[PDB]
């Protein structure tokens, strides 16, 4: 049912085009990135605090000392990526900030879609394409997919409308 909701939002709202959804995507994927990279960095800058080759036992919850080297982690990422965290407090606040802000932005976009206030089109694209039948972009390609979604899914997805679309009116490319 939720997968259907996703595809409805594509076909009717062009929701992938919406910059509020795009910021949501950035915050979710950026949050997953931070989760992975921080966990991996701690686990690979650990101090040797025991003799075991499995290193989980060499940690004490009440200990005062950092269990990994912030200084070595900072130099690694500075040299690999160009920048690195130097402040552990900023690091962990940023891990909250990114996915929390992304989800908040996606919610704003959905509030617009409650009113059909979509990022559906680029007007300049439509004026050019209407006048110039050789002009084609990935944006115009996706609207054709949306038009297919609406026509092929609406009769069963919106049964209260009692849609009957005769086979001759359905949008279809060649052969398919």
């Amino acid at each position: 049912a939720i997968f259907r909701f996703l595809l409805f939002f594509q076909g009717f709202h062009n929701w992938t085009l919406n910059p509020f959804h795009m910021m949501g995507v950035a915050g979710v994927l950026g949050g997953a990135l931070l989760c992975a990279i921080h966990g991996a960095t701690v686990e690979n800058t650990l101090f040797q605090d025991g003799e075991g080759a499995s290193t989980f036992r060499a940690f004490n919850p009440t200990q005062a000392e950092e269990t990994y080297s912030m200084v070595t982690a900072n130099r690694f990422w500075s040299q690999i990526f160009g920048i690195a965290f130097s402040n552990k407090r900023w690091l962990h606040f940023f891990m909250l900030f990114v996915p929390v802000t992304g989800l908040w932005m996606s919610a704003i976009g959905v509030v617009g879609l409650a009113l059909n206030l979509r990022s559906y089109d680029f007007i300049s694209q439509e004026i050019r394409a209407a006048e110039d039948p050789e002009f084609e972009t990935f944006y115009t390609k996706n609207l054709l997919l949306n038009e297919g979604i609406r026509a092929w899914m609406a009769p069963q997805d919106q049964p209260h409308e009692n849609f009957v679309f005769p086979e001759e009116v359905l949008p279809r490319g060649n052969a398919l």
Binding site: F47, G50, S69, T72, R75
Partner: peptide, 17 residues
């Protein structure tokens, strides 16, 4: 492979970048 030697951490003997 078991971690950085606290008393001999290589990066502490390197010049800053």
């Amino acid at each position: 492979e078991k971690g950085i030697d606290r008393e001999s951490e290589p990066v502490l003997s390197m010049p800053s970048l």
